[PDB]
Amino acid sequence: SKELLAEYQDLTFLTKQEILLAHRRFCELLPQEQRSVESSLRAQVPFEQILSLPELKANPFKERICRVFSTSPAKDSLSFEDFLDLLSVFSDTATPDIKSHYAFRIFDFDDDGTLNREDLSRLVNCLTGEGEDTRLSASEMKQLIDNILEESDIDRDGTINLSEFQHVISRSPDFASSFKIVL
C-alpha cells in the first residue's frame, strides 16, 4: 500500500508517471484509520476512508465499486495493487469488453456469476442510457437485445452468466466504449 517495492502484479493501461500520480492519490486517501503509524498495508484503504471525502455520499454504487476493486471481508479492502488494476479498467485507452465486465460485476453483487435476465437487461440499459439514447434509440437497442436473448437462450435458463452476453454486445451498443475516468 504505502511503499513502491513488494510484488505489484499489475497488467495495466498506466505508464510509470500515471502509476506515480495514482500512488500520490492513494497516499492522500490512506491516513485516518491508520493516521500516523502506517502498519496495516495489504488491508487499508477501507470503505470508511473512501466515505471520508465530499462527493462519496449520495453515489449509490460506491460500496459496489469498493467490492469489485478488492474486497470480500469488512475493512480489509482496496490495497495499492487493487488501486491500479481497478482504474486501469476505466483508463481512456482500455477496452470496451473490460468496462462491460465491470458493469456486470456491479449488478452480480453476492460473489457467484448467475444474475437474473432483468439485472442483465438493466446492465445493458444503465450503460445505453448514459451514452446518448433518445426514445427511438432505446426501442431499436432493446429490439437488438431481444435477438441476443434468443441464441444465448434465456427461456429455459432464467439466471445467466454475462460472459456470453458481453462478447455479443462488443459488436456495437453502447456506453461500454466511454465508461471512463480522467487521471
Curated annotation (Swiss-Prot):
Domain of life: Eukaryota
Domain EF-hand: 95-130, 140-175
Tagged with keyword Transferase: no
BP-aspect Gene Ontology terms: angiogenesis; apoptotic process; cell adhesion; cell division; cellular response to growth factor stimulus; cellular response to nerve growth factor stimulus; cellular response to tumor necrosis factor; cytoplasmic microtubule organization
Binding site for Ca(2+) 1: D108, D110, D112, T114, D119
PANTHER family the UniProt entry points to: CALCIUM AND INTEGRIN BINDING FAMILY MEMBER 2, CALCIUM AND INTEGRIN-BINDING PROTEIN 1
Function: Calcium-binding protein that plays a role in the regulation of numerous cellular processes, such as cell differentiation, cell division, cell proliferation, cell migration, thrombosis, angiogenesis, cardiac hypertrophy and apoptosis. Involved in bone marrow megakaryocyte differentiation by negatively regulating thrombopoietin-mediated signaling pathway. Participates in the endomitotic cell cycle of megakaryocyte, a form of mitosis in which both karyokinesis and cytokinesis are interrupted.
Residues reported to bind Ca(2+) 2: D153, D155, D157, T159, E164
The protein, known as: Calcium and integrin-binding protein 1
Compartment annotation: Membrane; Cell membrane, Sarcolemma; Cell membrane; Apical cell membrane
Disulfide bond in keyword set: no
UniProt topology in membrane: Lipid-anchor
Illness: Epidermodysplasia verruciformis 3: A form of epidermodysplasia verruciformis, a rare genodermatosis associated with a high risk of skin carcinoma that results from an abnormal susceptibility to infection by specific human papillomaviruses, including the oncogenic HPV5. Infection leads to the early development of disseminated flat wart-like and pityriasis versicolor-like skin lesions. Cutaneous Bowen's carcinomas in situ and invasive squamous cell carcinomas develop in about half of the patients, mainly on sun-exposed skin areas. EV3 inheritance is autosomal recessive.
Subunit description: Monomer. Interacts with MYO1C. Interacts (via C-terminal region) with PPP3R1 and CACNA1C; the interactions increase upon cardiomyocytes hypertrophy. Interacts with the heterodimeric integrin alpha-IIb/beta3 (ITGA2B-ITGB3). Interacts with ITGA2B (via cytoplasmic domain); the interaction is direct and calcium-dependent. Interacts with the protein kinases PLK2/SNK and PRKDC (via the region immediately upstream of the kinase domain). Interacts with PLK3; the interaction inhibits PLK3 kinase activity. Interacts with PSEN2. Interacts (via C-terminus) with F8. Interacts with NBR1 (via C-terminus).
Tissue: Ubiquitously expressed. Expressed in the epidermis, hair follicles and keratinocytes. Detected in platelets and in cell lines of megakaryocytic and erythrocytic lineages. Both isoform 1 and isoform 2 are detected in various cancer cell lines, with isoform 2 being the predominant form (at protein level).
Effect of substituting F165A: Loss of binding to ITGA2B
Further facts: The binding of either calcium or magnesium significantly increases the structural stability of the protein in comparison to apo-CIB (calcium- and magnesium-free form).
Induction, per UniProt: Up-regulated during breast cancer progression.
Organism phylogeny: Eukaryota, Metazoa, Chordata, Craniata, Vertebrata
GO cellular component: apical plasma membrane; axon; cell periphery; centrosome; cytoplasm; endoplasmic reticulum; extracellular exosome; filopodium tip
GO molecular function terms attached to this record: calcium ion binding; calcium-dependent protein kinase inhibitor activity; magnesium ion binding; protein serine/threonine kinase inhibitor activity; protein-membrane adaptor activity; small GTPase binding; transmembrane transporter binding
Keywords: Angiogenesis, Apoptosis, Calcium, Cell adhesion, Cell cycle, Cell division, Cell membrane, Cell projection, Cytoplasm, Cytoskeleton, Differentiation, Golgi apparatus, Lipoprotein, Magnesium, Membrane, Metal-binding, Myristate, Nucleus, Phosphoprotein, Repeat, Spermatogenesis
Effect noted on mutating E164Q: Cytoplasmic localization
